[model samples]
Target: GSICEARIDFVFPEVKFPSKKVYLAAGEELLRKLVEVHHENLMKSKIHYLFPTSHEQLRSLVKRSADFVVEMCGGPPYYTLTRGEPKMRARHFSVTIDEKAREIWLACYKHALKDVHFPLSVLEEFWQWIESFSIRMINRRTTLEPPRRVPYSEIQDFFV
Candidate 1:
């Protein structure tokens, strides 16, 4: 568990997003698979995968039900928790977030979501919102200088 010095001081509460309950129901296993797909798509090592680290980590950053709810859905909530509602592209200023990483993050997440076994309606709702996050977080320079031609693993019938 890591410690932090800051918090969500002034939460601008609005009517919660429509998918909030489904997001809350998404558990650590779902979160784990997200990290897995993300790393594999980015071809990043396991250590950089940030979800499912520990509850201690959660407590340090999850300041409210809103944070908890977003984390449950496998969107990268750590940035919001630690850095505030960031211009996500700016947050990754050091790393180039080129097209490959951005797309892989979404594509692998789509695969991972199928693996999570959420109901089709839930999946669609979740994915629509997840897409927005991917767009928002896109950094300019990607690890794939000239986008790596990747084998987007064929989608599977994971729910059964």
Candidate 2:
């Protein structure tokens, strides 16, 4: 992947008030599906670093990820106002994420949204945010690495 020299930026939807609650719920729902239903297949995507090792650990990861998603959805700054963790890039800097891992991550996020039955409008809006944000997280070399032992198409079919 071609490396970048610019800061990643996108206009998050403006969160008014309790409308922020809707986005938060959607974010929490997506991560829940990932933990409760699709994480087995997620690990197979060769992106195990994205997941936690135990159910309890999953909740912590879910909280952060959901907050990130909520923030992106133009909601209250749950992540910044509370945790004060570094933004996505700094948070994931230690991981080596290639394009394949990125693809699988996106796929899992998509699968989670579908499993949670997010309405079409919510899906469309959330999708727009993640698709772009996901790409911006890729920091490793951009070479065409060998494919996963099991193709993602096959792994995908195993998800609920």
Candidate 3:
């Protein structure tokens, strides 16, 4: 590991919504595919312990997450229609989401986005949203340092 001696305040970066064209072009199926692949990558990573152990439960979680993402990307409000307001941070409070976990989560998305061939035109918008959006989920703090920023330029090569 990493070291964590002092605790510093963490400020979450601003999150931007992806353009409506993202949903218009990619549609819900593609976004769901992205979330499914993302969850698969997360399940294989070192932080797999953070997810539910049951297969059925894991599938349900992935579907719900897909719904949330679909809604966020300007698609239909599938998530809110069923799950109410998306108080995502409050929902994740039960889990121990530290900075390290956020990193792993984003890393998984990096690969998943590539695997799904997410549209390049709107890829940066999606990446930026998740990059900052994920920070809000960090309920536990293993390090005092602020979360790392992975701008689209830094990882765009992987998607192309």
Candidate 4:
């Protein structure tokens, strides 16, 4: 299986993410794995925001999504007043789905998660919830290799 449920948030620029091609190549797999892990755990608090998935409202939504979920679930004043639940699938259905693109998503996320030093409880909840999100991204029938651990060395470009 996986070491744990995984969730990570990346700070992006004006809605244009770190890098679309490199991100999709890397992040999809990681995200897929997160989804599977969530499925197994059945953690419902999951929410994820894939940036550069669109050029629209990327920067503003990153903190917005996470902040909303945390507060509504009982954190504090943050994201709940705005976009709720994310409705991710409905937003991205028009895009084409493919294997390489999925891989890039996982790759980008693998790198992105490095910054978050989460507590066990927070990490567990976030991982399970975000994993459930992977399914929403499946646009059509795109083949994905089973989720596997990826080393940073495999990535050609790094998003800071």
**Which candidate has the highest lDDT of all?**
3
Model 4, span 1-160: residue lDDT tens: 6587675432111221122332233343343343333222222212232234332554344445445444433444455366655566676676664434444554444434433322222333343333334444556553333333333334323423
All candidates' lDDT scores? 0.49, 0.59, 0.90, 0.39
How displaced is residue 35 in candidate 4, in Å?
A: 17
Could you tell me which residue pairs clash in candidate 2? 1-142, 13-74
Q: Which one wins on TM-score?
A: 3
lDDT of 2 by residue, 115-140 (tens): 76765545445555556555656677
lDDT by residue for model 3 (1-160), tens: 9997986496777889787888987889999999999999999998999898888998999989999899999999999999999888999999989888999999999999899998888888899999989989998877667778888898878776
lDDT of 1: 0.49
Residue 155 local lDDT, model 1? 32
Any idea what lDDT model 2 has? 0.59
TM-score of each: 0.48, 0.63, 0.91, 0.42
Query: In model 4, which range of ten residues has the least summed lDDT?
Result: 10-19
Better of 1 and 2 by TM-score: 2
Question: Which parts of model 2 are misplaced by more than 4 Å?
Answer: 1-41, 144-160
User: Where in model 4 is the C-alpha error above 4 Å?
Assistant: 1-58, 68-73, 77-80, 97-103, 144-160
